[PDB]
Amino acid sequence: TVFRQENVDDYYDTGEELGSGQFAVVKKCREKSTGLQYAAKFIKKRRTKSSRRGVSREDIEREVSILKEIQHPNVITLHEVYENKTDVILIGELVAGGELFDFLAEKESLTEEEATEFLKQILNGVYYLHSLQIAHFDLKPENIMLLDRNVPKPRIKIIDFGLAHKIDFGNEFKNIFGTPEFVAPEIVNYEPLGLEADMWSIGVITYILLSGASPFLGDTKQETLANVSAVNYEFEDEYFSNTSALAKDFIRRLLVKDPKKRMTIQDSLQHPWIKPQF
Numbered sequence: 052t053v054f055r056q057e058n059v060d061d062y063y064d065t066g067e068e069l070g071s072g073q074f075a076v077v078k079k080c081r082e083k084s085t086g087l088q089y090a091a092k093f094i095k096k097r098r099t100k101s102s103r104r105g106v107s108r109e110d111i112e113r114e115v116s117i118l119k120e121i122q123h124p125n126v127i128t129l130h131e132v133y134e135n136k137t138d139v140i141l142i143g144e145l146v147a148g149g150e151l152f153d154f155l156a157e158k159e160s161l162t163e164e165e166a167t168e169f170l171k172q173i174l175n176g177v178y179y180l181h182s183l184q185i186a187h188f189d190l191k192p193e194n195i196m197l198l199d200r201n202v203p204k205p206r207i208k209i210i211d212f213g214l215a216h217k218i219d220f221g222n223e224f225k226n227i228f229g230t231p232e233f234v235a236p237e238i239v240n241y242e243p244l245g246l247e248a249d250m251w252s253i254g255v256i257t258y259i260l261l262s263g264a265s266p267f268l269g270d271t272k273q274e275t276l277a278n279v280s281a282v283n284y285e286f287e288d289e290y291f292s293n294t295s296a297l298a299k300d301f302i303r304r305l306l307v308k309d310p311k312k313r314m315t316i317q318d319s320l321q322h323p324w325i326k327p328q329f
């Protein structure tokens with residue numbers, strides 16, 4: 052599939068840099084014709100077939116195709132796509148209140164109500180995605196943005212669909228691998244992957260929201276990955292003595308090695324706490 056090949060500078064002005072990945076930079080921008088503001092993600096293209104640098108056409112097209120489908124208050128929208136020789140440029144929804152997650156770093160420890168207010172929104176976004184058989188595969192606090200701080204009212208949107216896949220046969224087998232602290236054992240063990248991997252990541256995010264501590268983090272990436280595969284975590288009393296038994300129960304039912312035994316997104320919404328690499 053091809054994208055708009057006019058110069059993006061003829062239609063938009065860019066401003067502040069909003070963030071970065073290894074092969075991507077995101078900038079605030081403004082559409083000249085409407086004055087409306089967006090975020091433009093510039094993704095570096097591969098310069099050859101066998102190149103390790105940049106993102107393959109197939110991977111870019113997949114992200115774009117997923118972004119085109121989705122429309123939900125807790126997930127980003129896509130506005131336009133441009134491309135030139137070096138970049139594909141996604142123009143989408145500007146989320147201006149920063150990462151979850153710089154908010155977690157700047158702020159003191161959260162109450163359970165605070166944590167569940169964020170968490171319920173993440174669950175609603177993921178419920179939408181999973182209903183569509185879309186696995187995000189990269190859920191982590193850096194990919195949960197506030198829309199808003201300020202309106203607190205602290206509404207969120209899930210971002211960065213670079214690893215997302217349609218799961219039309221129950222699982223995908225192709226070496227998808229996110230950030231060690233947040234990946235499920237099946238990712239670590241290079242096993243077939245499905246919607247369940249996202250539910251594990253939600254358990255990790257929930258543990259961090261409540262405690263300020265990362266459940267599997269070691270001093271090196273290999274240690275982190277070994278910890279994940281072995282389900283080597285515990286609830287430290289120093290961090291969790293204030294925390295309700297139901298909150299711990301919710302996390303315990305997500306941080307389960309066997310994907311088939313892990314809570315699903317629907318299970319997570321019915322749970323008594325919620326129900327109203329190298």
Ligand SMILES: OC[C@H]1O[C@@H](n2cnc3c(NC4CCCC4)ncnc32)[C@H](O)[C@@H]1O
Binds near residue numbers: 090091
């Ligand atoms: O993903 C790298 C970092 O850039 C930041 N980031 C990524 N995407 C966005 C975005 N809108 C997406 C709509 C479609 C294109 C962009 N809006 C604001 N910040 C973003 C965030 O800090 C993230 O951790």
